[PDB]
Amino acid sequence: GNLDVKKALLLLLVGGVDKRVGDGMKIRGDINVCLMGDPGVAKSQLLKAICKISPRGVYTTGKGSSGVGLTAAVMKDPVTDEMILEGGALVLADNGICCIDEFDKMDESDRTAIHEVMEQQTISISKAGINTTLNARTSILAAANPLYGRYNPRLSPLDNINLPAALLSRFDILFLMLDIPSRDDDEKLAEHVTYVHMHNKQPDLDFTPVEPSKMREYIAYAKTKRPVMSEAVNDYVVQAYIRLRQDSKREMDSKFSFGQATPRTLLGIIRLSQALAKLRLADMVDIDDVEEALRLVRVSKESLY
Amino acid sequence: RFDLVYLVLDKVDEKNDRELAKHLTNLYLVLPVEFLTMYISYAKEHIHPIITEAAKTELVRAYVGMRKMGDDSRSDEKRITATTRQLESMIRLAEAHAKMKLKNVVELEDVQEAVRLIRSAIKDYATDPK
Amino acid sequence: SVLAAANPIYGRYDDLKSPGDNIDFQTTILSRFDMIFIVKDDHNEERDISIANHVINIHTGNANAMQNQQEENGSEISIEKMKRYITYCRLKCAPRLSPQAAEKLSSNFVTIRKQLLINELESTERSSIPITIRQLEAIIRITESLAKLELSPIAQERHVDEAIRLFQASTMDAASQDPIGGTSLSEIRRFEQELKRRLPIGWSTSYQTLRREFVDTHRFSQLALDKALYALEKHETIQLRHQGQNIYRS
Amino acid sequence: VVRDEEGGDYTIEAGALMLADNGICCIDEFDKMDISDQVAIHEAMEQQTISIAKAGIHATLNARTSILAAANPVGGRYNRKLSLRGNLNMTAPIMSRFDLFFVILDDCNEKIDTELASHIVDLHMKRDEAIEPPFSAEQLRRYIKYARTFKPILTKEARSYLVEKYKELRKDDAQGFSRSSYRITVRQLESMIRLSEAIARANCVDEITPSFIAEAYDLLRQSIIRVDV
Amino acid sequence: RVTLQEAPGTVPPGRLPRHREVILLADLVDVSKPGEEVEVTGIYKNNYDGNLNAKNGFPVFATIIEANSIKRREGNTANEGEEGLDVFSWTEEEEREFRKISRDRGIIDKIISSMAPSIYGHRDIKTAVACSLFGGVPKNVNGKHSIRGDINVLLLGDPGTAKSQILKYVEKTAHRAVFATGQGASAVGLTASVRKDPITKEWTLEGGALVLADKGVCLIDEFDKMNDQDRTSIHEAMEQQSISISKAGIVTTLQARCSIIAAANPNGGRYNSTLPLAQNVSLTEPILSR
Amino acid sequence: PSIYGHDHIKKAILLMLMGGVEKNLENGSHLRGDINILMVGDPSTAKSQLLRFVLNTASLAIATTGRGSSGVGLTAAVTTDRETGERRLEAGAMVLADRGVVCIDEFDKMTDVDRVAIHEVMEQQTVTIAKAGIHTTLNARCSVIAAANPVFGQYDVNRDPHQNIALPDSLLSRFDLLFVVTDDINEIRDRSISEHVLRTHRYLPPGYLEGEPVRERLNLSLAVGEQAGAKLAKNKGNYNGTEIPKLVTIPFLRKYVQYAKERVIPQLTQEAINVIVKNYTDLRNDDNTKKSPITARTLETLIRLATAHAKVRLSKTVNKVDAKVAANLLRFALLGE
DNA sequence: AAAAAAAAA
Ligand SMILES: Nc1ncnc2c1ncn2[C@@H]1O[C@H](COP(=O)(O)OP(=O)(O)OP(=O)(O)O)[C@@H](O)[C@H]1O
Ligand SMILES: Nc1ncnc2c1ncn2[C@@H]1O[C@H](COP(=O)(O)OP(=O)(O)OP(=O)(O)O)[C@@H](O)[C@H]1O
Ligand SMILES: Nc1ncnc2c1ncn2[C@@H]1O[C@H](COP(=O)(O)OP(=O)(O)OP(=O)(O)O)[C@@H](O)[C@H]1O
Ligand SMILES: [Mg+2]
Ligand SMILES: [Mg+2]
Known part of the structure; x- marks a missing residue:
């Protein structure tokens, strides 16, 4: 299952609108998606599969290994102890896909780093006069869980991520995977798992005409095509943002208060429409892309209940 | 102890949201150069304006005026908003208003600009009462 | 072997306060210990006179003679001889039990466990001092040490009775020491009213009659026995003589 | 006390009071000190020394200082209805340490604030150097260092007036209430003696006149006038 | 060296x-x-x-x-009364004068009156301080019983009562004197501590404040404001006269023959005459009894 | 045999010592194969003794205490060899137990920091050391058994199970089986256990008298050591007669374990699959109170329990009886009889 | 490089 999560992963792979705008204003094609769900939903396995299929993917976590954040991998490395270092940098943060599990686990240092890599902002932490900043242009994909370990009937922002709301508002797309006990879905899940176990392989019950190396080729092929923006959707996206602020007029109704006012919502809508044009379409952005981005946002919010 | 303070409150309205949408979409689709920096350096180095006796009366009148508003027809002893910090803020703002345009002595325009720009923030500094 | 000295919270035990909030040790730590003794201070001026006499004697001017006679009359042995004897006994002997002793220990353990349950069902909180199978092993070890003292290759009832006596002392002093911690009190005043009203000074009545009367009424047996023995604990108008039959009013 | 990690320093570091030896320490915002300093101070002033014993190093340091502090009454504005103890949150034992108190209030009088603003403006632009004190700073320092070389004594009538004044000051304050007003100790008598000596020094006189005692008593009484108002 | x-x-x-x-x-x-x-x-x-x-x-x-x-x-910074390497040493004629003046009537009264000659009143405090700094005789019974021979004094009262001056005079008086105060002393500061020598690089023992107070007096001021963790570490010092350390593989017991004199202030800064001592101070029975 | 009761605990230990097989896929990466068991209970209920027995009877095991361990030194260490003059990694406690079992006591008293070092092992059974210029992944495919006390002195049956256990749910979800034990006071059980314990203490080693303590013995007479089927000397196992049901000795049981862990690799079938899916669907939708929440990973536990039970009876196929017994054991461990 | 004691936050 989880077709919409995989669709969001596809939209993440292609990337959004990029290569700057007039008069030097900065825009990034990277998409930031945070996944929420209870333990035991195979979100970690999905992240591992994404890292496998993405050649630029990197997996990190809060400590466990020290030389992965805020420090260069060559610090104090040479036998001469030449103190080779770039200063403030991350692991392959240039055009990389950073994947993190237990997003609430990391300490203040890695939290500061992930806040510093916001919106293609370079890391300029200095210690001994070094300022060789790493130009971080990366897409952030993280998975986390509430501290309760289960969804709660109370106000959903009280569960949130246990992270500052400023960091939460940065993310383009928020998904919530809540486990609902039912017969007609758990039967299918158990049947799928047991049929996988019986064959000791990926079963023929799966029906996929396309292959992982084929996706590896086609993602580069579709990235090469690189459609650009068409102006005819400006009025439609403006009125959609007007209706989004109309929703912001009802965010005080509470119990799913995440429908807050943020220009980054509109920017992410534009980027997602651009990515929808990029994934298959030629050098043209369709209103259907805007509609699909809107539907994806509504589905993202609808998981709150 | 700050010299000034400013507040931004984004509230959802049709007109301003429409204007921001149009403006940012057009950006998505008269500006000087380091000349500004050299002008700033020249003003900081070669310009040392002073205030004049004419503006002293206006300063005193403004201080009294905000002292006048600090009390009303009730003996509650309303909050004393006319602090000496207000005086020093007005003085510095007026002197800086003489700093640009390469002037050497202050005029009235300096003091009215200073008092307007200092009381605009105060008028938005109130809480839910009044 | 661990020999530990400790002081309760708030200095003196403060028996008016509940036993639960007088000891800060958890259940896990207390179970490993198996001989806990509560040394409470007392005042009756006779033990006090005796202690003062003993200290004034134990000053160096007198004890240096008297203690010497303890090695001259054979009452006590020197420390080094005790060390030699104890290491010899540790090396040589290692006793064993007998089936009658096992039966006695089993019955005693069942009895104390049932008594603990009886206290717990009334106090409606968990006991601050637990009784577990570790305690049964403890009594077994105490019996073995008592038999080991006299180099006996087998342990018999003579040592078992002393071990059970010591365990009962160390149990009633700490665990079962006032388990109540101080229908509520409404029946207590009601029960205090009738005995003053119905039974004057100098006369007496059978326990069976009162128990029958206040089981027929609403008081029931559980409330009466506690009230009766606490009116006795007050000890200013109620006296028991002639076994548990004669309820004499002093 | 500080030490480098696995480095044999065991060295003490000097606070502001340590640096202010034989001088004047000026503390601003006295209200928000913490427990350690709040309990070290009332030993620092009265005994003129500080003692510490931590982690194997012990010492007794000199802290001969004169302290001057400023405070802000709780709630922002001083409540004239209450007293010094009611308005201030700082503790009673620290109160007895100090020798003098000064409370200064602002108001909304239109006459005063206009003069205040005018005086500020005059020194800002017109006469930034042309202020008129009766004496120059050099003359002030000359007189200060000349008067510092005098040690006054006390005479018979001075002692009699002093003991009478101390008796009166102990009596009139203790007559107010019990278990609510406790402010006069031997420290007050010592402070009165010190103020008399300082005033005698100011006039460059090797003896003390009961008028100086009267002035010191007036200052101390006005310290208790201020708490009443 | x-x-x-x-x-x-x-x-x-x-x-x-x-x-x-x-x-x-x-x-x-x-x-x-x-x-x-x-x-x-x-x-x-x-x-x-x-x-x-x-x-x-x-x-x-x-x-x-x-x-x-x-x-x-x-401790004894007063270095003007007499000259010599050791001011606590006597000649033979000084000993003869000691014996001559030790036989007059009412010598205890003169000794009590001669302590702190510039502090008025407080006769009981002077007597208690004299009895504390003269000390008693430790007793050993058959080599298996030990009886402490030192006296502890606790002072409690209102401010402005010259307690600190008396403590300073005692510090000036005793042969061995150690001064601590309030929050300025830690639990492991009074007791001997464990440190690693930077040269030989192994654990060793460092003498605490109480060890310097052996055969002498340890003076504490502001006893009430000292933290409980820094207060509960002197029980053996006042009673057992021994310090035991089991830290970092080092097991050793240190002797400590010290007399503790303390000063403090009651709750609220003043003493309530109509209240019991249990409601006047926050100390408990184990510390008060010693 | 000297522990009274806890029969289901014994069955769980038996199934854990010879757990299921590990799975590897060209696309599915790796699947965990063995079983981990955690027990929580009030003091003096014979947990540490069972842990010592498991240490003694296992092919390979390492004893670890929560307080007396450091997580960084638990996995690997950096030591400079005196001869070569270079620094090389020294294997930690858990790495030595590869393809073994690790027992940890006072688990709830063990420092929180080092807990993450355990979780990594519970994640992919591999520890990564990146320090001082060494970057290596070390295999550690061991099983872990632990016993911990509740937060209070005694278990409160009226409280939230999460409330009684100090460990976070993140690692508690990893353990396949959670057991809660309590010493309910009952005079019948008290008398039975008293008789049993007294019976145990009245024991004497063969050929040695009761008047003197145990003395140390020398090594074997032979420094290096080394008619069939008609004797059954130690084959039947019943050394002493106490019950109609049989018993087996420790050496024969260990030989059985050695044979089973190597000679048989069972394959599951659809008949047990139907029972497994039916009981998972039933247990998930019973909609009543339970000790712990259940999720998709429990079906994996059922599969490997059925595999272990197929291994026990030495069959290459999994029958529905193994599914039934696994479901019964899980219901006991989560519902209670 | 890794374990263990101390004072300040
Ligand atoms: N939809 C699913 N299909 C198949 N297996 C699933 C599914 N959801 C969960 N699983 C199972 O869950 C396990 C992986 O989920 P896992 O618990 O590691 O993820 P998680 O939700 O990030 O939790 P945690 O933080 O506890 O690791 C696997 O054993 C997998 O078989
Ligand atoms: N007879 C006396 N009684 C009390 N104080 C006296 C006496 N004679 C002189 N004084 C003076 O009174 C002051 C008392 O000292 P101090 O303020 O330290 O007392 P304290 O109550 O012990 O102090 P604190 O407890 O605050 O440390 C000293 O300055 C001392 O010179
Ligand atoms: N069912 C039993 N059969 C035999 N002995 C038992 C039984 N239950 C408890 N005991 C005895 O209880 C004693 C306590 O042992 P142990 O400390 O290992 O138990 P535990 O439950 O693990 O306790 P803890 O929580 O303190 O570790 C042992 O001497 C053991 O023999
Ligand atoms: Mg996960
Ligand atoms: Mg145990």
């Missing part, structure tokens, strides 16, 4: 101390102790050294001090 630093009371504030090396010949061995401020009269000498020249680049010479006399100056 020993390393000599600068006295913290003599160094200008905020600066660093200066180190020197002192060499003690025969009869001077173990006279000085770690942490004890001393005054040494000696001879200044200089000698050649290799790596000092190597690292400085100039013909510089190392200097050491060959000690000739040592005088202890810990």
Whole structure:
């Protein structure tokens, strides 16, 4: 299952609108998606599969290994102890896909780093006069869980991520995977798992005409095509943002208060429409892309209940 | 102890949201150069304006005026908003208003600009009462 | 072997306060210990006179003679001889039990466990001092040490009775020491009213009659026995003589 | 006390009071000190020394200082209805340490604030150097260092007036209430003696006149006038 | 040979101390102790050294001090009453005068009245302090019973009662005196502590404040404001007269014959005459009984 | 045999010592194969003794205490060899137990920091060391058994199970089986256990008298050591007669374990699959109170329990009886009889 | 490089 999560992963792979705008204003094609769900939903396995299929993917976590954040991998490395270092940098943060599990686990240092890599902002932490900043242009994909370990009937922002709301508002797309006990879905899940176990392989019950190396080729092929923006959707996206602020007029109704006012919502809508044009379409952005981005946002919010 | 303070409150309205949408979409689709920096350096180095006796009366009148508003027809002893910090803020703002345009002595325009720009923030500094 | 000295919270035990909030040790730590003794201070001026006499004697001017006679009359042995004897006994002997002793220990353990349950069902909180199978092993070890003292290759009832006596002392002093911690009190005043009203000074009545009367009424047996023995604990108008039959009013 | 990690320093570091030896320490915002300093101070002033014993190093340091502090009454504005103890949150034992108190209030009088603003403006632009004190700073320092070389004594009538004044000051304050007003100790008598000596020094006189005692008593009484108002 | 630093009371504030090396010949061995401020009269000498020249680049010479006399100056800073290396030593005629004046009637009254001659009243405090600083006789019964022979004194009262002055006089009076105060002392500061020597790199023992108070008095001020963790570490010092350490594989017991004199203030800053002592102070029975 | 009761605990230990097989896929990466068991209970209920027995009877095991361990030194250490003059990694406690079992006591008293070092092992059974210029992944495919006390002195049956256990749910979800034990006071059980414990203490080693303590013995007479089927000397196992049901000795049981862990690799079938899916669907939708929440990973536990039970009876196929017994054991461990 | 004691936050 989880077709919409995989669709969001596809939209993440292609990337959004990029290569700057007039008069030097900065825009990034990277998409930031945070996944929420209870333990035991195979979100970690999905992240591992994404890292496998993405050649630029990197997996990190809060400590466990020290030389992965805020420090260069060559610090104090040479036998001469030449103190080779770039200063403030991350692991392959240039055009990389950073994947993190237990997003609430990391300490203040890695939290500061992930806040510093916001919106293609370079890391300029200095210690001994070094300022060789790493130009971080990366897409952030993280998975986390509430501290309760289960969804709660109370106000959903009280569960949130246990992270500052400023960091939460940065993310383009928020998904919530809540486990609902039912017969007609758990039967299918158990049947799928047991049929996988019986064959000791990926079963023929799966029906996929396309292959992982084929996706590896086609993602580069579709990235090469690189459609650009068409102006005819400006009025439609403006009125959609007007209706989004109309929703912001009802965010005080509470119990799913995440429908807050943020220009980054509109920017992410534009980027997602651009990515929808990029994934298959030629050098043209369709209103259907805007509609699909809107539907994806509504589905993202609808998981709150 | 700050010299000034400013507040931004984004509230959802049709007109301003429409204007921001149009403006940012057009950006998505008269500006000087380091000349500004050299002008700033020249003003900081070669310009040392002073205030004049004419503006002293206006300063005193403004201080009294905000002292006048600090009390009303009730003996509650309303909050004393006319602090000496207000005086020093007005003085510095007026002197800086003489700093640009390469002037050497202050005029009235300096003091009215200073008092307007200092009381605009105060008028938005109130809480839910009044 | 661990020999530990400790002081309760708030200095003196403060028996008016509940036993639960007088000891800060958890259940896990207390179970490993198996001989806990509560040394409470007392005042009756006779033990006090005796202690003062003993200290004034134990000053160096007198004890240096008297203690010497303890090695001259054979009452006590020197420390080094005790060390030699104890290491010899540790090396040589290692006793064993007998089936009658096992039966006695089993019955005693069942009895104390049932008594603990009886206290717990009334106090409606968990006991601050637990009784577990570790305690049964403890009594077994105490019996073995008592038999080991006299180099006996087998342990018999003579040592078992002393071990059970010591365990009962160390149990009633700490665990079962006032388990109540101080229908509520409404029946207590009601029960205090009738005995003053119905039974004057100098006369007496059978326990069976009162128990029958206040089981027929609403008081029931559980409330009466506690009230009766606490009116006795007050000890200013109620006296028991002639076994548990004669309820004499002093 | 500080030490480098696995480095044999065991060295003490000097606070502001340590640096202010034989001088004047000026503390601003006295209200928000913490427990350690709040309990070290009332030993620092009265005994003129500080003692510490931590982690194997012990010492007794000199802290001969004169302290001057400023405070802000709780709630922002001083409540004239209450007293010094009611308005201030700082503790009673620290109160007895100090020798003098000064409370200064602002108001909304239109006459005063206009003069205040005018005086500020005059020194800002017109006469930034042309202020008129009766004496120059050099003359002030000359007189200060000349008067510092005098040690006054006390005479018979001075002692009699002093003991009478101390008796009166102990009596009139203790007559107010019990278990609510406790402010006069031997420290007050010592402070009165010190103020008399300082005033005698100011006039460059090797003896003390009961008028100086009267002035010191007036200052101390006005310290208790201020708490009443 | 020993390393000599600068006295913290003599160094200008905020600066660093200066180190020197002192060499003690025969009869001077173990006279000085770690942490004890001393005054040494000696001879200044200089000698050649290799790596000092190597690292400085100039013909510089190392200097050491060959000690000739040592005088202890810990606590008792009053150094004007009499002269000599040890002011606590007596001649034969001084002993004869001691015996002559020790036989007059009412000598205890004169001794009590001669203590702190500039503090008025408080006769009971003077008597208690005299009885505390004269001490008793430790008792040993058959080598298996020990009885403490020192007296502890606790002072409690209102401010402005010259408790600190009396404590300072006691510090000036006793042969061995250690002054602590309030929050300025820690639990492991009074007791002996465990430290790693930077040279030989292994755990060792460092003498605490109480060890310096052995055969002497330990004076504590502001006893109430000291934290409970820093207060519960002197029970053995007041009662068992022994300090036991089991830390970092080091198991040793240290002797401590010290008399503790403490001052404090009651709750609220003043003493409520109409209340019991249990509601006047926050101390408990185990500390009050000692 | 000297522990009274806890029969289901014994069955769980038996199934854990010879757990299921590990799975590797060209696309599915790796699947965990063995079983981990955690027990929580009030003091003096014979947990540490069972842990010592498991140490003694296992092919390979390492004893670890929560307080007396450091997580960084638990996995690997950096030591400089005296001869070569270079620094090389020294194997930690858990790495030595590869393809073994690790027992940890006072688990709830063990420092929180080092807990993450355990979780990594519970994640992919591999520890990564990146320090001082060494970057290596070390295999550690061991099983872990632990016993911990509740937060209070005694278990409160009226409280939230999460409330009684100090460990976070993140690692508690990893353990396949959670057991809660309590010493309910009952005079019948008290008498039975008293008789049993007294019976145990009245024991004497063969050929040695009761008047003197145990003395140390020398090594074997032979420094290096080394008619069939008609004797059954130690094959039947019943050394002493106490019950109609049989018993087996420790050496024969260990030989059985050695044979089973190597000679048989069972394959599951659809008949047990139907029972497994039916009981998972039933247990998930019973909709009543339970000790712990259940999720998709429990079906994996059922599969490997059925595999272990197929291994026990030495069959290459999994029958529905193994599914039934696994479901019964899980219901006991989560519902209670 | 890794374990263990101390004072300040
Ligand atoms: N939809 C699913 N299909 C198949 N297996 C699933 C599914 N959801 C969960 N699983 C199972 O869950 C396990 C992986 O989920 P896992 O618990 O590691 O993820 P998680 O939700 O990030 O939790 P945690 O933080 O506890 O690791 C696997 O054993 C997998 O078989
Ligand atoms: N007879 C006396 N009684 C009390 N104080 C006296 C007496 N004679 C003189 N004084 C003076 O009174 C002051 C009392 O000292 P101090 O303020 O330290 O007392 P304290 O109550 O012990 O102090 P604190 O407890 O605050 O440390 C000293 O300055 C001392 O000179
Ligand atoms: N069912 C039992 N059969 C035999 N002995 C038992 C039984 N239950 C408890 N015991 C005895 O209880 C004692 C306590 O042992 P142990 O400390 O290992 O138990 P535990 O439950 O693990 O306790 P803890 O929580 O303190 O570790 C042992 O001497 C053991 O023999
Ligand atoms: Mg996960
Ligand atoms: Mg145990």
